[PDB]
């Protein structure tokens, strides 16, 4: 049942530039270890932007150039959750972040709002 597949993102919020955030994508209805998964972001008006991917099994991880060295994607196979560690946050990182899974049949979460402000 495709219905049983669920992705729920949390961790978003307000944070100052240079700060850090940990996003969680909690998955149910399927095992995260066996399914490549992706983080996307979407700012209003601008087009959707792929952020990172974690391949099933040991296939590794990949990152968009804008985030290389700043973000880390990881996976907890037991808890069936995928994380996005966000460090050295800039204002251009403001967007809705959501996770997705699936080839041919794609599923996605609603997203979690991340706002990065500049400070003194």
């Amino acid at each position: 049942s495709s219905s049983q597949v669920q992705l729920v993102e949390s961790g978003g919020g307000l944070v100052q530039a240079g700060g850090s955030l940990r996003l969680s994508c909690a998955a149910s209805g399927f095992p995260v270890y066996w399914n490549s998964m992706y983080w996307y972001r979407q700012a209003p008006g601008k087009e959707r932007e792929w952020v990172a991917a974690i391949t099933s099994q040991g296939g590794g991880t990949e990152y968009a150039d804008s985030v290389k060295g700043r973000f880390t994607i990881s996976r907890d196979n037991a808890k069936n959750t995928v994380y996005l560690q966000m460090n050295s946050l800039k204002p251009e990182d403001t967007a809705v972040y959501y996770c997705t899974v699936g080839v041919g049949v794609s599923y996605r979460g609603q997203g979690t709002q991340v706002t990065v402000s500049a400070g003194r």
């Binding site: 729920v8 909690a26 998955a27 149910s28 209805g29 808890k79 069936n80 959750t81």
Partner: peptide, 18 residues
């Protein structure tokens, strides 16, 4: 609250929201 054992159709548990 991290996932918990949720009863599936097959009478077994799978990760789900708590």
């Amino acid at each position: 609250c991290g996932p918990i054992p949720v009863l599936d159709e097959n009478g077994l548990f799978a990760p789900g929201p708590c």
